[PDB]
Amino acid sequence: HMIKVLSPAKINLGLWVLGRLPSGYHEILTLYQEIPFYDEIYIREGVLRVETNIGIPQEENLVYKGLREFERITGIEINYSIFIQKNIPPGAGLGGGSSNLAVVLKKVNELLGSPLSEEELRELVGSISADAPFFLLGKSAIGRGKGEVLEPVETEISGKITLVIPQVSSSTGRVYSSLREEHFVTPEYAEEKIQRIISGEVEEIENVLGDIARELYPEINEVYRFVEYLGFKPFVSGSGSTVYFFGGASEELKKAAKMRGWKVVELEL
Numbered sequence: 343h344m345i346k347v348l349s350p351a352k353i354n355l356g357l358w359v360l361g362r363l364p365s366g367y368h369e370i371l372t373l374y375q376e377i378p379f380y381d382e383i384y385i386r387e388g389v390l391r392v393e394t395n396i397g398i399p400q401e402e403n404l405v406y407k408g409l410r411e412f413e414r415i416t417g418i419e420i421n422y423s424i425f426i427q428k429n430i431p432p433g434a435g436l437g438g439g440s441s442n443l444a445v446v447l448k449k450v451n452e453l454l455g456s457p458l459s460e461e462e463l464r465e466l467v468g469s470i471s472a473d474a475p476f477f478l479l480g481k482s483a484i485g486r487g488k489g490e491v492l493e494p495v496e497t498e499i500s501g502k503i504t505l506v507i508p509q510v511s512s513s514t515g516r517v518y519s520s521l522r523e524e525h526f527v528t529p530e531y532a533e534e535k536i537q538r539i540i541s542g543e544v545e546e547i548e549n550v551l552g553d554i555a556r557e558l559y560p561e562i563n564e565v566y567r568f569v570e571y572l573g574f575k576p577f578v579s580g581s582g583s584t585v586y587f588f589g590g591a592s593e594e595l596k597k598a599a600k601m602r603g604w605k606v607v608e609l610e611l
C-alpha cells in the first residue's frame with residue numbers, strides 16, 4: 343500500500359546569534375522560508391526500515407531515530423519501510439534531514455490514528471532537530487530560541503531564487519563552535535533586521551554562520567565570489583554550504599557548476 347510524500351527544503355533569510363546557552367547550543371533569531379525543492383519519500387507497510395539513495399546508515403538517519411522514539415514513547419510498534427530519494431544534499435544548510443524527520447513522523451502518526459498531539463509530535467521531532475518543528479508548519483516563520491520557537495509570518499518576497507550548492511558538506515556544529523563574542527548581536531538589532539526582510543528588503547539579509555562557513559570551507563567562499571562576479575548579491579543558508587541569490591542561472595553559472603560539481607537549483611518564490 344505504498345505512498346509518496348514530499349519533503350521540502352528551507353532557506354534562512356538571515357540569521358543572528360544572540361549568545362551561548364549552558365546546553366552548549368546557541369540562542370538564535372532566523373527567518374525560515376520553505377522552498378519548492380523536495381526529497382521524495384516512499385512509505386510502505388513492512389519491517390521498520392529507513393533507506394536512502396546516497397548511503398546514509400540507518401542508525402544515523404534522523405527519520406529512523408524519530409521512529410524508534412515514536413515506538414518508545416507511545417508503545418506502538420512501527421511497521422513501515424521508508425525509502426528517501428535525497429535531492430536535498432546533507433550539509434547544504436537546507437534542513438533536508440530535519441524535513442525528512444518532520445514529514446515522515448507526521449505521516450506515520452496520522453497513519454496510526456494520531457496517538458500523539460501536534461504539541462507532542464512537535465516535542466518529539468524538536469528533541470532530535472531544532473529545525474524539524476519548522477517543517478511541521480512550513481511556509482514562512484520566525485525561528486526563536488534554538489529555532490524551534492516559531493512564529494508564522496507573511497513576507498513580501500517573491501520571484502526567482504537560485505541555489506548554488508557546492509559539493510562540500512558543512513558541519514553545523516563546527517561552524518557554531520568557531521563563534522566568538524564579536525559575532526553575537528542583541529535581539530533588538532536582529533528583530534529590526536527580520537522585520538525589514540519580511541517586508542521584502544532582501545538586501546537586509548545577513549548571516550554570521552555564513553561568514554564563518556566561508557572561512558572554514560573555502561569552496562563556499564568560491565561560490566560566494568562567483569555569484570558576485572555574476573552581478574548578484576549572494577546569501578548563505580544555515581551554516582552553509584548553500585549560497586543563494588535572487589535571480590536566474592545563466593549558462594556561464596551552469597557551466598561553472600557542471601565543471602566544479604556545484605548543484606544549481608532554480609526556484610520561484
Ligand SMILES: Nc1ccn([C@@H]2O[C@@H](CNC(=O)CCc3nc4ccccc4[nH]3)[C@@H](O)[C@H]2O)c(=O)n1
Nearest residue numbers: 366367368369370433472488489512513514515518
Ligand atoms: N540553535 C542552535 C542549533 C544548533 N546548534 C549546534 O548545531 C547542532 C547540530 N550538530 C549535531 O547534530 C552534531 C554535530 C554535527 N553536525 C553536523 C552537520 C553536518 C555534518 C556533520 C555534523 N556534525 C549542535 O551540535 C549544536 O552544537 C547550536 O549551537 N544552536
Ligand SMILES: [Br-]
Nearest residue numbers: 521522523524
Ligand atoms: Br565566545
Ligand SMILES: [Br-]
Nearest residue numbers: 510559560561
Ligand atoms: Br572546502
Ligand SMILES: [Br-]
Nearest residue numbers: 556563564567
Ligand atoms: Br576572498
Ligand SMILES: [Br-]
Nearest residue numbers: 548549577578
Ligand atoms: Br547571508
